Amino acid sequence: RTGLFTPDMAFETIVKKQVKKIREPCLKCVDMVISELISTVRQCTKKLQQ
Amino acid sequence: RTGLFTPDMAFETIVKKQVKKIREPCLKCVDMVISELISTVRQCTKKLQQYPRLREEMERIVTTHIREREGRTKEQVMLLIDIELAYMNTNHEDFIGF
Amino acid sequence: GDQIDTYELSGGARINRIFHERFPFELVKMEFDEKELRREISYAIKNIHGI
């Protein structure tokens, strides 16, 4: 078809493509938080118990 | 959803609804032209009066042929409108943008 | 519909709008020599006026 107005899917399909990129850093953040919890447990466990 | 831009199918819908109304006058024009041709033929056959039974035959043949062409003319007239409904060409001469 | 091929191509029957914007090129690919047009017009006039 000949275009009169900019289609609304040209916005939506770019936004979805941009949004898919942020899955990775969130999982990196979760892994880092888990690492810190493990380190804290070690400090509270290995150093104070004979 | 919420629109960022005015949708395009409303334009097509309104144009189709208005275009459909044109079929009537085209058929009226065709009928008028057929009548006028029959009148002209019946005038042309006046001079063929020296003989009987040759004026009626020539009027019958030419009138029958002219009436028979009504079908093909009306069919093409309808097709030229269906073709104007099938597609919507907005790149001819129009207010692009706005 | 969704799931359009935003990156790889310009394709999927959108090529046909190029034909609809390419046929306007074929209609002007044709050319003629104006001297032949003038000669042909001159003979058209001389052949319409018989005597």
Curated annotation (Swiss-Prot), chain A:
Q: Where in the cell is it found?
A: Cell membrane; Membrane, Clathrin-coated pit; Cytoplasmic vesicle; Presynapse
What is known to happen upon mutating D8R?
Answer: Significantly decreases receptor-mediated endocytosis
* Regions annotated as coiled coil: none
Q: How is it modified after translation?
A: Phosphorylated by CDK5 leading to synaptic vesicle endocytosis (SVE) activation.
The reported effect of M9R is: Significantly decreases receptor-mediated endocytosis
Q: What is known of its domains?
A: The dynamin-type G mediates homodimerization and plays a role in self-assembly. The C-terminal proline-rich domain (PRD) mediates interaction with SH3-binding partners. Is required for DNM1 self-assembly.
UniProt record similarity statement: Belongs to the TRAFAC class dynamin-like GTPase superfamily. Dynamin/Fzo/YdjA family.
> What is said about its interaction partners and assembly?
Homodimer; homodimerization is mediated by the dynamin-type G domain which promotes assembly-stimulated GTPase activity. Homo-tetramer formed from two dimers in the absence of lipid. Oligomerizes into a helical polymer that self-assembles around the vesicle membrane, when associated to the menbrane through lipid binding.
State the function annotated in the UniProt record: Catalyzes the hydrolysis of GTP and utilizes this energy to mediate vesicle scission and participates in many forms of endocytosis, such as clathrin-mediated endocytosis or synaptic vesicle endocytosis as well as rapid endocytosis (RE). Associates to the membrane, through lipid binding, and self-assembles into rings and stacks of interconnected rings through oligomerization to form a helical polymer around the vesicle membrane leading to constriction of invaginated coated pits around their necks.
- Which medical condition is this protein associated with? Developmental and epileptic encephalopathy 31A: An autosomal dominant epileptic encephalopathy, a heterogeneous group of severe early-onset epilepsies characterized by refractory seizures, neurodevelopmental impairment, and poor prognosis. Development is normal prior to seizure onset, after which cognitive and motor delays become apparent. Developmental and epileptic encephalopathy 31B: A form of epileptic encephalopathy, a heterogeneous group of severe early-onset epilepsies characterized by refractory seizures, neurodevelopmental impairment, and poor prognosis. Development is normal prior to seizure onset, after which cognitive and motor delays become apparent. DEE31B is an autosomal recessive form with onset in the first months of life.
* Name the UniProt record assigns to this protein: Dynamin-1
Which organism is this entry from?
Answer: Homo sapiens
Read off the lineage from the record.
Eukaryota, Metazoa, Chordata, Craniata, Vertebrata
What's the name of its gene?
DNM1
Measured against the full-length protein, the chain present covers 399 to 448 of 864
From Swiss-Prot, chain B:
Describe how it is modified after translation.
Answer: Phosphorylated by CDK5 leading to synaptic vesicle endocytosis (SVE) activation.
Q: Which domain of life is it from?
A: Eukaryota
Q: Where in the cell is it found?
A: Cell membrane; Membrane, Clathrin-coated pit; Cytoplasmic vesicle; Presynapse
Instruction: Please quote what the entry notes about the protein's domains.
Output: The dynamin-type G mediates homodimerization and plays a role in self-assembly. The C-terminal proline-rich domain (PRD) mediates interaction with SH3-binding partners. Is required for DNM1 self-assembly.
Subunit-level organization: Homodimer; homodimerization is mediated by the dynamin-type G domain which promotes assembly-stimulated GTPase activity. Homo-tetramer formed from two dimers in the absence of lipid. Oligomerizes into a helical polymer that self-assembles around the vesicle membrane, when associated to the menbrane through lipid binding.
Functional summary from the UniProt entry: Catalyzes the hydrolysis of GTP and utilizes this energy to mediate vesicle scission and participates in many forms of endocytosis, such as clathrin-mediated endocytosis or synaptic vesicle endocytosis as well as rapid endocytosis (RE). Associates to the membrane, through lipid binding, and self-assembles into rings and stacks of interconnected rings through oligomerization to form a helical polymer around the vesicle membrane leading to constriction of invaginated coated pits around their necks.
Q: Which disease is it linked to?
A: Developmental and epileptic encephalopathy 31A: An autosomal dominant epileptic encephalopathy, a heterogeneous group of severe early-onset epilepsies characterized by refractory seizures, neurodevelopmental impairment, and poor prognosis. Development is normal prior to seizure onset, after which cognitive and motor delays become apparent.
Recorded family membership: Belongs to the TRAFAC class dynamin-like GTPase superfamily. Dynamin/Fzo/YdjA family.
Indicate what this protein is called per its UniProt record. Dynamin-1
